Amino acid sequence: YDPLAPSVIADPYPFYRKLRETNTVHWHEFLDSWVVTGYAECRQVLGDTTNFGSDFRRIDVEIPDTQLSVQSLDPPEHGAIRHLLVSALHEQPLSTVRQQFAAIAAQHLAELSGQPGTVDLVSRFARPVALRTITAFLGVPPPDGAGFEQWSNAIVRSMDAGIEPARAEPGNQARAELSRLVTHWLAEADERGFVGAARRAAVPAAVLANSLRAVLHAGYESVSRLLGGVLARLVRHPELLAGPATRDADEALVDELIRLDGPVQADARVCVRDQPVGAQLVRRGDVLVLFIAAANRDPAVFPDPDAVRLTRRRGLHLAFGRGAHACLGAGLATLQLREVLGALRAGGLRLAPAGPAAYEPTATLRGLAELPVSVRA
Ligand code: HEM
Numbered sequence: 283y284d285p286l287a288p289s290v291i292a293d294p295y296p297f298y299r300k301l302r303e304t305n306t307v308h309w310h311e312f313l314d315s316w317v318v319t320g321y322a323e324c325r326q327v328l329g330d331t332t333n334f335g336s337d338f339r340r341i342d343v344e345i346p347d348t349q350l351s352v353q354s355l356d357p358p359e360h361g362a363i364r365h366l367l368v369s370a371l372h373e374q375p376l377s378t379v380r381q382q383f384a385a386i387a388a389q390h391l392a393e394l395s396g397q398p399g400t401v402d403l404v405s406r407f408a409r410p411v412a413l414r415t416i417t418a419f420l421g422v423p424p425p426d427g428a429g430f431e432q433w434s435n436a437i438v439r440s441m442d443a444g445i446e447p448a449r450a451e452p453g454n455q456a457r458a459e460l461s462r463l464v465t466h467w468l469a470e471a472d473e474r475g476f477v478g479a480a481r482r483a484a485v486p487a488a489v490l491a492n493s494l495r496a497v498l499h500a501g502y503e504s505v506s507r508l509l510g511g512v513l514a515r516l517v518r519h520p521e522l523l524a525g526p527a528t529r530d531a532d533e534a535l536v537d538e539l540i541r542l543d544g545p546v547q548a549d550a551r552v553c554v555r556d557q558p559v560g561a562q563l564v565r566r567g568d569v570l571v572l573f574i575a576a577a578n579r580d581p582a583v584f585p586d587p588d589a590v591r592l593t594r595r596r597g598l599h600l601a602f603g604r605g606a607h608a609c610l611g612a613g614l615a616t617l618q619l620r621e622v623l624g625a626l627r628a629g630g631l632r633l634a635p636a637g638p639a640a641y642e643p644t645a646t647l648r649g650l651a652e653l654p655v656s657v658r659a
Pocket residue numbers: 328336352353354364416496497500501502504505508540544545546549600601602603604606607608609610611612614615
């Protein structure tokens with residue numbers, strides 16, 4: 283199947299499942315990569331940095347030192363920047379973070395109220411909430427919302443350069459733009475917030491710069507598109523918000539919403555040393571694309587995998603990855619989604635579909651182009 287085909291983009295999960303039912307580890311000749319849709323296989327590969335990696339220099343590919351980043355480094359170089367970032371994260375008092383995240387979500391939901399017409403929740407909520415959320419965490423002044431979204435979208439689309447090579451160049455321009463933003467914050471930002479703390483811990487400057495850019499961009503786009511998908515489920519299934527509304531009830535719901543609507547559809551690795559993966563033998567130099575969203579629909583692990591079931595065992599889904607590169611912001615994201623759920627219950631606003639959910643032609647990171655709804659108090 284063509285991952286950018288409109289009908290695939292409309293709902294890829296049947297295509298994931300049919301791929302998996304024929305072979306959990308599938309060689310895609312025209313992409314020249316293994317496609318891994320089984321839960322056990324994605325989980326195996328994600329955690330094994332000895333045989334599968336993110337630093338293509340381990341297969342003798344020249345990567346300039348100027349381009350190195352936390353997400354493209356493996357042990358031993360990965361540990362230095364990784365724990366630097368985690369240490370800066372852990373300096374942020376969570377009471378403050380929750381206060382900020384809750385206020386941002388409430389503010390944008392109130393702007394939506396009193397609107398008697400159709401509203402786009404992507405541009406009106408997911409994106410602006412994501413941007414204010416991540417820059418509040420970083421302790422830096424928010425950039426212009428529309429302008430930032432354009433640069434960042436170019437980068438998301440460049441992730442599909444394997445499918446459409448022309449999508450690659452716009453990303454290089456957008457990366458350079460975010461690098462300018464990161465450079466400016468490193469020079470000017472307050473000692474409060476994440477940026478200030480990471481600057482103190484400092485690892486080479488390029489790794490730090492590109493790693494801060496990764497925090498900015500991953501955090502913006504992961505949260506933005508998580509909210510889009512979650513809201514899309516909620517507008518069609520408002521009963522999800524009618525639940526008990528306890529802490530533990532929202533914990534289970536958040537886990538299911540992240541399992542089902544996590545935006546990361548593909549997480550790539552390179553084979554550094556031969557290893558059996560599923561029914562196949564993967565060879566050194568082979569690229570593996572882990573379809574972790576499909577893995578998160580593996581019926582062997584998640585019965586009725588396309589259904590929200592609030593009594594499932596926690597700790598299973600792979601939407602934050604697993605192992606050395608597992609999402610640094612996983613705690614922040616589950617926190618942020620709780621506050622959104624909480625704000626929606628406190629808003630009592632009624633959001634009903636005002637048209638179809640429209641998805642953007644991005645295959646690696648799933649995102650809505652538009653989520654038209656009507657608001658009713
Ligand atoms: C405040 C929010 C977030 C921040 C700051 C953030 C940042 C990051 C960073 C810096 C990494 C790289 C870790 C490394 O390579 O060592 C990462 C990895 C990852 N993130 Fe997050 N992210 C956020 C939210 C999310 C959300 C909501 C999702 C999905 C629901 C997500 C999915 C992932 C995944 C799957 C990985 C692993 C990629 C891999 O295996 O290399 N992130 N994130």
